[PDB]
Amino acid sequence: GETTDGVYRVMTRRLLGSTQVGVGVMQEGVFHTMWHVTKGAALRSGEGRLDPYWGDVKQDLVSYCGPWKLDAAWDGLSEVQLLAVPPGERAKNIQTLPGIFKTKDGDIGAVALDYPAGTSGSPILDKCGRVIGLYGNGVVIKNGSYVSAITQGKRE
Amino acid sequence: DMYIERAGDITWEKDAEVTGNSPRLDVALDESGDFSLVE
Ligand SMILES: COc1cc(COc2cc(C)nc3ncnn23)nc(N2CCNCC2)n1
């Protein structure tokens, strides 16, 4: 199948038409997305099959064909870019300064950017182009707007 | 059956659109992976 590095749409035909349930990242032969996008199910890449290899519902992450490869981290200081991939619309970079989720287990970056639900799993980048985490697990705040965590896994 | 379609190279774009605010929020993470606003 298509093993090429880059950002990919996740699509289903089980609803009406072809529907974008979310987004993902291919790197070093491994496909990375959020657990709530696939719920752990297998994926088709043309003739090709992708099988789930690692996942955790609490981190809300899943890898396919191999272990989690994305290890870069927000430095706590700089702007970043959401490589947003909205349903039926073209990829598109958005630059933002992250906010903070304060938790009982320590602090994580947050991106206050609003997109449809099927944008879930769109990658966040640092200035060198490295993926620091996935967009699309977070909270709805006062306004009615959405804030996502910068969700990142661990590389072995 | 779900399937994947390539949508872009992962690069930083100079003169991307710059927007969004940067809230500092207190949040809880449950066993199901749901974040919630703690106030
Ligand atoms: C792009 O990723 C996502 C994921 C989700 C997940 O769905 C919901 C629904 C509700 C009722 N409250 C929620 N609290 C946290 N997530 N969450 N929702 C959205 N959005 C964008 C803004 N409009 C629509 C909701 N985007």
Swiss-Prot record, chain B:
Residues 1-39 are cytoplasmic. This is Serine protease subunit NS2B. It is found in: Host endoplasmic reticulum membrane. Required cofactor for the serine protease function of NS3. It is a multi-pass membrane protein. The chain holds residues 1418 to 1456 of 3419 of the full protein. Forms a heterodimer with serine protease NS3. May form homooligomers. Interacts with human SPCS1. Interacts with non-structural protein 2A. Residues 4-39 are annotated as: Interacts with and activates NS3 protease. Residues 8-30 are annotated as: Disordered. The central disordered region transitions to ordered by binding to NS3.
